[PDB]
Amino acid sequence: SAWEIPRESIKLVKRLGAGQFGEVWMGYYNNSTKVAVKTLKPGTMSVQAFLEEANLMKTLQHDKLVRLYAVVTREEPIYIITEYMAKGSLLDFLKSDEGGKVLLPKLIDFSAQIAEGMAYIERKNYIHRDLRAANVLVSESLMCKIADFGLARVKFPIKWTAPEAINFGCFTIKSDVWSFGILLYEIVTYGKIPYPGRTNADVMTALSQGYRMPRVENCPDELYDIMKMCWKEKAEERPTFDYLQSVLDDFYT
Ligand SMILES: CCCc1cc(OC2CCNCC2)c2nc(Nc3ccc4cn[nH]c4c3)ncc2c1
Numbered sequence: 368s369a370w371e372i373p374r375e376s377i378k379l380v381k382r383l384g385a386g387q388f389g390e391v392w393m394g395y396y397n398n399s400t401k402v403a404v405k406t407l408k409p410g411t412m413s414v415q416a417f418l419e420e421a422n423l424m425k426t427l428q429h430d431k432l433v434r435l436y437a438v439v440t441r442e443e444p445i446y447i448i449t450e451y452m453a454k455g456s457l458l459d460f461l462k463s464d465e466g467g468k469v470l471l472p473k474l475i476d477f478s479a480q481i482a483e484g485m486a487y488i489e490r491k492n493y494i495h496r497d498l499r500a501a502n503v504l505v506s507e508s509l510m511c512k513i514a515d516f517g518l519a520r521v522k523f524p525i526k527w528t529a530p531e532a533i534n535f536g537c538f539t540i541k542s543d544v545w546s547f548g549i550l551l552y553e554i555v556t557y558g559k560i561p562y563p564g565r566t567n568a569d570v571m572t573a574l575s576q577g578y579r580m581p582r583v584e585n586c587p588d589e590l591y592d593i594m595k596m597c598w599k600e601k602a603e604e605r606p607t608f609d610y611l612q613s614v615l616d617d618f619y620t
Contacts, residue, residue: 370425372396372437377446379404383455388412389444393451402436403452407445414445421447423516427491431484433504433514452504452512460505461558472619473509474554475590479615480511485547486608488513489540495519496538498546499527500553525567526560530574531602541602547611548597555586589618 379392389406396402407417424435439446457477460466481503488495495502496518504514520538529545531537549561562570562580570578579598582591593614599605606614 370421370435370438371441372439372448374439374442374446377402377404377439377448388417396436396448400436401451403449405447405449407447409443409445414440417445418447420515420517420519423519424449427488427493427516427519429484429487431480431487431510431512433512449514450512452514453507454505454509456501456514457503457505457511458500458553458558461500461554467557471555471585471587475615475618477511478551478554479612479619481513481550482547482608482612482615484511484513485543486612488519488543489608493519493521494538494540495543495546497524497527498543499524499550500558503550526562526570529602530600533571533574537602539602540608541605544597544605544608544611545602547608548594551590551594551597552580552583555583555590593618 376397377394378398379394381393383391383393383403387408388411389408392404392406394402394404407414418438418440421435421438424433428434433452434450435447436450437448439448454460454463461469485495485498495513495516497515498513502513502515504512506512523532524546525533527546527549529538529542532542552561553559562573565573577600579595582588586594593611596606597611
C-alpha cells in the first residue's frame, strides 16, 4: 500500500483496448506523466484476483518488463497504473504499415530484447505462461517489454502452449521457451497467426502426432534452427533464455 494513489491524480483520455473484464486507457498522472490504466469492470472478475497481477508486478522489475507505477483500489472501478508504451503491442506494430517497413535485423533485435526479459524471469524462478506478441509492448524508442502477467506464477493461449503443459498441466520456464519459438514465428511473419488455417483443437491433435511448423519463406535457416531448438518435444532439451539471448545477439553481427 505504498503503491496506492488518489483517484484524483489520474485522468483518462483514450481507450486502448476493451475486454470483458474491462478496458485499458491511456491517461496522465498529475497531468505530467502519461500512463496506461487497466480498468476492472466489477462483477466480471473479483477484485482480489484482478489485483494479483499488480501484486506480482511489485515483485518483478526489469527494463524489458512493463513497469508498475501505482494502483487505485478504494472506489468502484479499480485501476492498475503502468508505464505507457507508444506503439502498443508488438503485434499491432508489426501489422501496422511502419512495422512492414522494418526488416530482419530489427526483428532479431526485438527477438533478443524479449529473450532478455525472459532471462530475468528464469533467473527469478518465475513463468509467464502467456508469452506471445500480443503481450509484448513497443515504445516510441522501439524497445520491447513483456506486458501482461495475468497468468504468470512463481485462459491459456493454446497455440503458444507447450505439449507437456497442454497434456499434463506441466507449465515451467521450458514451456515459456516453447512459446518463445512460437513468438519468433509471429515476429518473422510480421504478425501472422501460428498454425495458419487451423483450430486450437486441430493443433492439440497435430502436436500429439509430432507436428511442427515448417520454415517460413523469409526466416533464415539459422534462425529457424533457434525456433526448432525451442520446440523440442522433451522440455529438458530446450535451451535457456540466457542461451537464446546470446545466439540472438550474435546472429545480429
Ligand atoms: C500489465 C500491463 C498492462 C497494460 C495493458 C495495455 O493494454 C494493451 C494490451 C495489448 N493489446 C492492446 C492494449 C497497455 N497498453 C499500452 N499502450 C498501447 C496499447 C495499444 C495501442 C494501440 N495503438 N497504440 C497503443 C498503445 N501501454 C501499456 C499497457 C499496459
